């Protein structure tokens, strides 16, 4: 079944062209979404460096307070191959946008638990000298 295999396998490459096309658009959302996520985190760090300071002051203030069939076929596949150019524009950028953030997230979790502790201590030392 020559024509039955050169067309079915081709019929898939066609249902394949859109596939990577559909996944490319779906990937674009990952681009715009991972871009939005990167932004919404720039403010998180901002609020993380904001708490870091205030706490240091507060703590100190408390001490101071305590004391043509194949021609098209190829074109359809070529489009699938060209999409890699877009598939590349994704995995890369965001892929790295992942490291920068994660390494930043950890620094956010730590200080997040750090301030928490200094709050428990400050409260304890404060209770003993309350009204």
């Amino acid at each position: 079944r020559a024509d039955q295999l050169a067309d079915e396998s081709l019929e898939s490459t066609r249902r394949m062209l859109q596939l990577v096309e559909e996944s490319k658009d779906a990937g674009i959302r990952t681009l715009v979404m991972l871009d939005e996520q990167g932004e919404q985190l720039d403010r998180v760090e901002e609020g993380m460096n904001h708490i870091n300071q205030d706490m240091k002051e507060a703590e100190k203030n408390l001490k101071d307070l305590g004391k043509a069939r194949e021609n098209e076929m190829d074109e359809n596949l070529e489009q699938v191959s060209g999409i890699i150019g877009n598939l590349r524009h994704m995995a890369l950028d965001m892929g790295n946008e992942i490291d920068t953030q994660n390494r930043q997230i950890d620094r956010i979790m730590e200080k997040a638990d750090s301030n928490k502790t200094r709050i428990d201590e400050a409260n304890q030392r404060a209770t003993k000298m309350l009204g």
Binding site: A58, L77, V80, A91, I98, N102, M109, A122, N123, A126
Partner: protein, 61 residues
């Protein structure tokens, strides 16, 4: 066989990056969830800090 083998692995190579994408994207999911349990647990104490900092206000101010 020309264009065939040509377009053959052309994708087998794109099958790798996703293997990296699916993973690097899932590793984040768990890390963020970890921050969700600490960041909140933090403000949870802030509710105490505010009240505690206020009690100190009625003693030295």
């Amino acid at each position: 066989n020309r264009r065939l083998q040509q377009t053959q692995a052309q994708v087998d190579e794109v099958v790798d990056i996703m293997r990296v994408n699916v993973d690097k994207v899932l590793e984040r999911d768990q890390k963020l969830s970890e921050l969700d349990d600490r960041a909140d647990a933090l403000q949870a104490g802030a509710s105490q800090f505010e009240t505690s900092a206020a009690k100190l206000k009625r003693k030295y101010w």
